[PDB]
Every structure is written in structure tokens, then in C-alpha cells.
Amino acid sequence: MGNRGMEDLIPLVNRLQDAFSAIGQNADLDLPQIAVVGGQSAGASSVLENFVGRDFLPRGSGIVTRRPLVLQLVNATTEYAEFLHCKGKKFTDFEEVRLEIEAETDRVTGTNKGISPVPINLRVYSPHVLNLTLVDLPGMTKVPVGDQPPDIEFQIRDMLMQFVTKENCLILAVSPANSDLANSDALKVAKEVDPQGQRTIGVITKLDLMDEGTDARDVLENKLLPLRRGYIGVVNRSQKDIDGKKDITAALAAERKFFLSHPSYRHLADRMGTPYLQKVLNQQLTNHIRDTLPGLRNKLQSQLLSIEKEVEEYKNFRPDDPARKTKALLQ
């Protein structure tokens, strides 16, 4: 468990925050939000919870991600979770969080394949995290089922747009492997909001369920559909493994064995897997935080130059100075 790529950046944020708080001002540390776009049952929730490093989201066959859960990670001194609709309660166990999320979804949408545009706001405080926004959006579908209205397709798409047309957002586009990449909706959306690939990261899931004799070797090499940041393959837990309470360590070991043994992927083994995605996102955040330094320097330099002309005289103030008095008199 855990995510150790945060540890090397947290003290940088703290030091910058302290440097600005010294003057009664904040730091414009506008880190990008992370939005996970995907088709229904593409695996977009298991990827997200593998980036956080905690097993707390509901996942599984069927329509589970019924509401647009928004997770806020706030750096703190201890570890706890809270909900805006459960104000005053404290959650010390992620299993309770998962069960409460399910109960809150059912309470509003019912037991059919319902949806609700209103998000759930879950905030987790921990000394090991950064101030991040994570958005788990409901998967897109083509036809209504259950008691959904005829426009279910358009309501879901509209829920996505308000979160991915915003600047400073990473579109983490998840598509299954045992399907044809040309028919992945997540990539159609990315091309509608990021016409040139600067933020979009491709992730290919379900590589272990490919039809025997076929592989995706020409997809992972960024040949079929060029994407500025390529595609990162991952292997998540299967439905049997979720129901079997499979450990996370075993899943990572199985993923590593899969890539090391597969005849068509050995040469890419060091470019794929869960920990590689963690490094890519952490590197993306680090590149962002460094890119803003010229603005902070220019603001501070301008303020310093503005005050210096008067500081030069204030620093020379003395309780007894007949020349200072005379200068003021003449002026």
C-alpha cells in the first residue's frame, strides 16, 4: 500500500507555503486536478484507487459509479476522512468509507440503474498527501437501462464536460484492452477538449483478457493512434480477485510476472505497470510546480523594488535627527 512519490514533493510545498505566510499571503500553488474519463466497465475506478494507494472505492461488474465522486486530499497532521453530508462524523476506516459511499448513492438514486448529477464531496486529511482534486466520473453508455430516462447518454456526457473543459486538469483516459481502440469513447472526448495532446494520458486496461493469439503490441508503441504521451498498460484485479479479497502485493507481483513472461511485452516491461503511472503523474505535477516559479519571482521582485525607494529612508529613521526635521520642513 501507500504512495511514496509524494514524499519528495511535500516539503517543497510546505516551505513555499511558509515563505508566503511570512508576509500574510498565500502561494499560488495551483496544482492540476485529475479527472478519470472512461467508458462503463472500462476499469476507471480501479486505476484511480491504485493511484491513491487505498482500497476504498466501490468497484465491480454493473453500474456502480452512479454519482460523480469528488475526492479532495488535504495535507494535515493525522489521517482521517469526512463527508460533507455526514458533517460532524469522523471516519477512521476506509471500509466504512466505502460502505457509506454505497449507502449515500442508494439513498438518492434508488436500487435501479439510476444516476445523479449531484457530486459527493469526500475529503481525506493526511500528512502524506498533497492538496489534490480527484474526480471519479460515471462511465458513458449508449442506451438506457432500468429506469433511466431516454437521454441518459447526454446527461452523462454533460456531467463530464463541466470537469474536463476546465484548464489545469489531467484527462486520464482509460480504455479496455479486449476491445478495439478505435471504438473507445474516452479518446473521443479527449480529442474534443484537448485537440493537441498536452494533458491527455492514455491508459490501457484489461491486457490479461486479450483473445488468445492477438496482442496490442502495435498499440502500446503509439503507432495505431499517436498520443503525445503514449499509452501505459496496466493489469487490475479481476472480478474474482475483488471477491476473493486478493492482496495488493500479490496483484503487483502478478502484474510484474505477466509483463516479464509475455513474449510480446518483455521489451516494454520497464515502461508499464502501476508504479510507472505513479511516476508519470508525479513527474507531471513536479513539472507544473516548477513552471510557475518565474511568476512568483516577478511578483516579489516588483514589490521589493516598489518599497525599496522608501525603505532607504525609513531604515535611517532616528529619534533625534535635526537634518530629517529640516528636510521635512523644506519639502
Partner: peptide
């Protein structure tokens, strides 16, 4: 006037400290 002087000097030193920290953070 005394209060304005004191605030200007405090802000001056704090801004100098902020630059001395940011430059070291960038490395």
C-alpha cells in the same frame, strides 16, 4: 507615521527572506 514606518520595514525584511527561501528551493 511611526506605524507606517514599522510596517514598511517589516514587509521589506519579510520580502527579502521570501526571495532568499525561493532561490534556495529552486536550486
Amino acid at each position: 507615521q511611526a506605524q507606517r514606518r514599522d510596517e514598511m520595514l517589516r514587509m521589506y525584511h519579510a520580502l527579502k527572506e521570501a526571495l532568499s527561501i525561493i532561490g534556495n528551493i529552486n536550486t
